[PDB]
Amino acid sequence: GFFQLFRFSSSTDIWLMFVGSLCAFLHGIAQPGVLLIFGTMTDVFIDYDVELQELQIPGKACVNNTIVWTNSSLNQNMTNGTRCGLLNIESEMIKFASYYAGIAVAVLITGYIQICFWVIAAARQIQKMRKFYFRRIMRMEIGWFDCNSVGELNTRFSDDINKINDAIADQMALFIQRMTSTICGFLLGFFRGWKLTLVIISVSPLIGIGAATIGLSVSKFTDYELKAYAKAGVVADEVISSMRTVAAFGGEKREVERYEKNLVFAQRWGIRKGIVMGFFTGFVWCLIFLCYALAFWYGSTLVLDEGEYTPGTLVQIFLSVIVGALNLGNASPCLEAFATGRAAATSIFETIDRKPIIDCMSEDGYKLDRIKGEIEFHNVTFHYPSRPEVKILNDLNMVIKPGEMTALVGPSGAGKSTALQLIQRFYDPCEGMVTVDGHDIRSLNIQWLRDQIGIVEQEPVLFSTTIAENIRYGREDATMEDIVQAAKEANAYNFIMDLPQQFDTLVGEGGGQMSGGQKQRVAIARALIRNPKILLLDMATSALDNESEAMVQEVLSKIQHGHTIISVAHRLSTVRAADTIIGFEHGTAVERGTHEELLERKGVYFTLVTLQSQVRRILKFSAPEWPYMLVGSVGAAVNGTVTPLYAFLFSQILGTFSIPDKEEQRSQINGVCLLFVAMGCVSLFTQFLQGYAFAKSGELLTKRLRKFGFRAMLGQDIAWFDDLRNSPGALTTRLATDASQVQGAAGSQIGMIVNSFTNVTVAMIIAFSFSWKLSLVILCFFPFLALSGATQTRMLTGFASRDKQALEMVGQITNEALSNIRTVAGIGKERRFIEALETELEKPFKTAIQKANIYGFCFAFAQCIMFIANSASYRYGGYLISNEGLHFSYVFRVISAVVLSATALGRAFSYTPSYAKAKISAARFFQLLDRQPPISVYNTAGEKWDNFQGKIDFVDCKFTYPSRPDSQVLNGLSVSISPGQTLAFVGSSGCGKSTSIQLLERFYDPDQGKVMIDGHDSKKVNVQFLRSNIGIVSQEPVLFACSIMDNIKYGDNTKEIPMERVIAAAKQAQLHDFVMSLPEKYETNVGSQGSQLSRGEKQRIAIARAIVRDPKILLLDEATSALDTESEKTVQVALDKAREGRTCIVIAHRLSTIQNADIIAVMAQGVVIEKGTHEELMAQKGAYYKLVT
Ligand SMILES: C[C@H](CCC(=O)NCCS(=O)(=O)O)[C@H]1CC[C@H]2[C@@H]3[C@H](O)C[C@@H]4C[C@H](O)CC[C@]4(C)[C@H]3C[C@H](O)[C@]12C
Ligand SMILES: C[C@H](CCC(=O)NCCS(=O)(=O)O)[C@H]1CC[C@H]2[C@@H]3[C@H](O)C[C@@H]4C[C@H](O)CC[C@]4(C)[C@H]3C[C@H](O)[C@]12C
């Protein structure tokens, strides 16, 4: 519902929203209410000019000029005596100039209450809706998190509640003043004259449809432009990310064709954005100017003869129906903000109240002292609440006698993580209650249950604090003398001394965190500090480095002793010294014995061991765009004069109700309300042209500035893609958003700087030609009105709404308590993370009570400055009607041409992309285009034409990784070759040998120690002619968003694009029978949407992508890392076939790949020591000799 968004309001938060309600009803009557003054004020100007200029003729009775020449100082001689000083102008303008000055004060102080008492009174609810939501989201099960994301529960905390902030706070008071001004705008048009407002009201829904689709079409075309660019920004976001393989196959010159062709969709919603917002700006415009010629043409007849409308109330019923039909349609961009919020709060308001099964309640249970360490599982059966169509635990039965160890052993997945997880009560058994020393796991306090058990996880995860209270989370009572007791027994005390500081070393997450073998040593102290009676460690040393494996398993196996331990094993050589291994095969704990009762029986421990335990820059660049920017700047000089030519002409029709002969008010008033018809029906056209051409110039620019941008980003060094800051998740935001900022320094500045030069010139010239002594009063208020035109269209600096970067500290304390929810529930309490959010949630609240009276202020001073500009300048205008002798038509033409072009000179300076961020956004593309990287594909290709035959010979290759500071030395070595053999590097692990063959292409170059191709050097061997003859294969395979054949097709775009060699390399590369076992012949699309392949049998595409070429050197760099050796043997047949006449370098990490082939040189320092074939690894140690020793 919608009025259910107002729930979380205390009693002091419904009165703070009610004095803002009747100050938004009371501000919202002054916009048609001030027409009551201007109605009756242009009638006292015009009842004075009649008796002035009728006295300006010595005509009819000159012995008594009707009344005038002092016939009021007599006694009773005035039978018609109105033509005297009855109508004193100067004493009447003071009776009007203090009418505006009262509205100016009573709209400054109610335009401040209505928008300070709705941003305060609705940034006080969200501090309570973003707080109940996080308190009940932590009391869920663990099962509710298994079918919800982390990234979906983190846009429903900062991106979704920021939509029911926009519906409650700002757009509600600023709605109800746009609704009580379109009620009083029509009703104060009826009560004056009923028949003269009924004709205008028939076109009044046509002026309001057209002005409700300008506001509703700015914030609705950003749904399309994100959804019409990203059909093409998913092509150049999967080439920059997979950048190693587009280089080595040479598809640089053609990949930008598949991005240029996909790009015109952004070129089409850009041109149909400056038409719809362009044409409908004219269709409002024309319909105002054609409506002035309907209330002054047919409205003249009623005031010309009828007489039942003085000409004041002919411009007062008319200007109040117009201003009550703009404000009707203008309340539609905020009647969208109500329904965006209403539809998007159904997910928050559901999660606030669910009351699920297990939680943090301290009532319903039986707290039980003296647990004797009894664990019992009755006959259970279990289902995950994500994939419920399986019985994971199939009728389990196990007992755990207290005192000593207990194992739990499976083949590969039998009771991997679920069987150890029921006992600390994360999930519930649907049958078979499980019990601990009497009564079962339910009917107990969960706060009591989770204090005995202490778990050691698979992976170590640590919170962002320091190592003092990263241990103190378990059992908060314990002291600094007592933490170190567990910090030594877990063997971190020798890490306490050798540390840059003691007990405050902020290396939790925002510091330099250490290795997993010394992160696992922190969690043991968290589990020992609480004095537990149960232990549970589930593959503790699983994802870490095996050097640490020795010392951390000594702490579990030998140091820990004294009570129950239920510990599974990463490998069974550790769990041999056990009490009762209760391992199993499927679902039911079958063995229940030691290794000697299974010396005669099968089990899964006596089974498994036999197979495992055996600016001028822009305009010159926008060169072909001279026709559109010229027709767009002739059409921007005609609708820049329509703002000061209206004011020259409205005061013309407002003066010719003071021409004395009654017939002249039928043909002078008709030949001026005919110029409005030629002013609307032109500005319906030229407003369209000024919007069409400038959304075609700067659109066809920014389609072309992406094509030149994406080529000169593609063909460069590999050594700056892997630079630190411009990572491929943040380079394609420089090419999506940042390439449209340049549009505001060529195309659209011309439509502001010539739409202002023929605006604030023709307005001054009309102003200064008539009354230069009145034009200097109102021109003092001139800068303060361009602020009321730049705020009327509303993105003034004064919104202060880019304080999202104070919600990032809130957005990190909510992520490190929800992305690791396994280790918060099972360890200690989540009570601190429902006290470390609610502390932190003050700093965005204080910056939404400091914004609530700056946007509160500058909304009112940009609303009371026109009403005081007419107060100090109609006042002085009456000083000149009566004393200095000018006409009354020359006040309306001077006071209204510098304010009618003072609001339009600031309304057009907010509809233009700013210029500060467009003179530097085009200053980083113009350096990206004009950049000369030292190695690149686009070079004029020389230094070529050598018949290769793979004679690639190394001489002392010292290397650095000269971009990323990984080391200062990578291993220098020198290996020669003859064509047809192997280099076969095996040895060190970290960046020593694989760098040297990632060096092999034109990727990196040696600073020293130059290499040869055929006696040449790889600074004077070109990139294009070398790379035709290599063949690489990578570690992670990557296949593009195409079919099976098309990636096989992708191997060579250099030649005539082959079909003939796919058949010859189908049965060679061992895919000829898997390409026939498919749902379709070759159109199996495996990119992003179809059924995904296995990496173990995607390698067979990754090898086969190379061999469609005619390579002279292979680069078999680190394939075949599939963890199932059945599928490894399938591709191991495939690597053996890509040989017999081709140079190879195969690293062969798993040593069964080929051994007797050729030399083995690299080592830990990588020095060439063994230039020898495989028979020389007996007297000196080699690859196989180390693992057998
Ligand atoms: C009629 C309005 C003036 C009354 C007013 O001040 N309302 C309160 C201001 S708000 O609640 O804070 O927006 C103004 C404000 C916004 C104006 C519109 C917007 O500026 C959008 C375009 C701008 C074009 O230059 C003219 C047509 C137009 C479609 C404008 C017509 C008209 O002058 C509007 C509708
Ligand atoms: C007259 C209307 C209300 C403001 C006003 O001038 N009232 C005079 C009384 S007082 O001084 O406030 O006392 C305003 C509101 C919207 C305005 C119109 C819109 O801004 C659209 C265009 C804008 C062009 O610059 C001028 C013509 C015009 C068609 C405007 C004429 C006039 O200024 C309108 C109709």
Curated annotation (Swiss-Prot):
Modified residues (Phosphoserine): 542, 1088
Binding site for ATP 1: 410-417
PTM comment, free text: N-glycosylated. Ubiquitinated; short-chain ubiquitination regulates cell-Surface expression of ABCB11.
Modified residues (Phosphothreonine): 541
Membrane topology, Extracellular segments: 39-102, 192-195, 296-308, 651-668, 875-885
Major localisation: membrane
Residues annotated as domain ABC transporter: 375-611, 952-1189
Gene Ontology terms for molecular function: ABC-type bile acid transporter activity; ABC-type xenobiotic transporter activity; ATP binding; ATP hydrolysis activity; bile acid transmembrane transporter activity; canalicular bile acid transmembrane transporter activity
Annotated ABC transmembrane type-1 domain residues: 17-340, 629-917
Gene3D superfamilies: ABC transporter type 1, transmembrane domain (1.20.1560.10), P-loop containing nucleotide triphosphate hydrolases (3.40.50.300)
Region (Mediates internalization from the plasma membrane): 1185-1188
Consequence of changing residue 292 to H: In PFIC2; uncertain significance
CDD domains, per database record: ABC_6TM_Pgp_ABCB1_D1_like, ABC_6TM_Pgp_ABCB1_D2_like, ABC_MTABC3_MDL1_MDL2
Disease linked to the protein: Cholestasis, progressive familial intrahepatic, 2: A disorder characterized by early onset of cholestasis that progresses to hepatic fibrosis, cirrhosis, and end-stage liver disease before adulthood. PFIC2 inheritance is autosomal recessive.
Function in brief: Catalyzes the transport of the major hydrophobic bile salts, such as taurine and glycine-conjugated cholic acid across the canalicular membrane of hepatocytes in an ATP-dependent manner, therefore participates in hepatic bile acid homeostasis and consequently to lipid homeostasis through regulation of biliary lipid secretion in a bile salts dependent manner. Transports taurine-conjugated bile salts more rapidly than glycine-conjugated bile salts.
Entry remark concerning the domains of this protein: Multifunctional polypeptide with two homologous halves, each containing a hydrophobic membrane-anchoring domain and an ATP binding cassette (ABC) domain.
Protein family per UniProt: Belongs to the ABC transporter superfamily. ABCB family. Multidrug resistance exporter (TC 3.A.1.201) subfamily.
Protein name from the UniProt record: Bile salt export pump
